[PDB]
Ligand binder design. Sequence first.
Ligand code: ATP
Length: 216
Amino acid sequence: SIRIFPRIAGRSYIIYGQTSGIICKRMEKSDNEFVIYNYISEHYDKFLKKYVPKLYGKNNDMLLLEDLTYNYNNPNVMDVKIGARKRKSHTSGFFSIRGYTNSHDYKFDPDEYLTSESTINHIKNFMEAGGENRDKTKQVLLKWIMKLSELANDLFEINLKFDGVSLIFIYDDDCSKCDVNVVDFSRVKLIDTNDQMTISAVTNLIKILSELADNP
Ligand SMILES: Nc1ncnc2c1ncn2[C@@H]1O[C@H](COP(=O)(O)OP(=O)(O)OP(=O)(O)O)[C@@H](O)[C@H]1O
């Protein structure tokens, strides 16, 4: 039993752990992701505890990570790239939606450059599986805004360049719970200042979600 993990985006080999609640991500190019998890653990442990899946350990080239979808009956997942891309500019200006649950139904294309209006529409598309209870969808948005606000505030004090990192947004079909966490440290770098570009990605998301939560 190798059970392939249903990824939203990326090209790394990710499988289910042999045990419950764990996924195994192969470090394809270097062990930098492991070096960065260990650096954050030693220098910014509060950031790791609040915003990042637990790293349970390492097996050869495999990271044993907390499965962020594990406690969900019917998870809907959106992957938003908020760190700098390797060569390309962001598809939505400050960030790039990499994919989401049911995106094929909406003709989402991760290579398409989007206007603000199309960006907002794809986020609304992601929220449609959450259903007709406007009040429950508002609560999911507000809980994301609560955590992302705190993240953006905390990023001012972190001397890392979060190149390539993604936000994984999750809500259950019934909107009974949600979360957002930072994943993919494989290109993160030590620097002597905060990462303003990544902070701008997060504040732009906060603005967009806040408009959605307030829309009548
Ligand atoms: N801890 C996690 N819990 C749940 N899903 C995760 C987790 N980490 C990754 N994912 C899933 O895997 C996808 C891609 O993961 P990630 O971005 O870490 O790897 P990647 O882009 O394939 O890797 P890399 O470019 O570093 O080789 C996400 O879109 C998401 O669906």
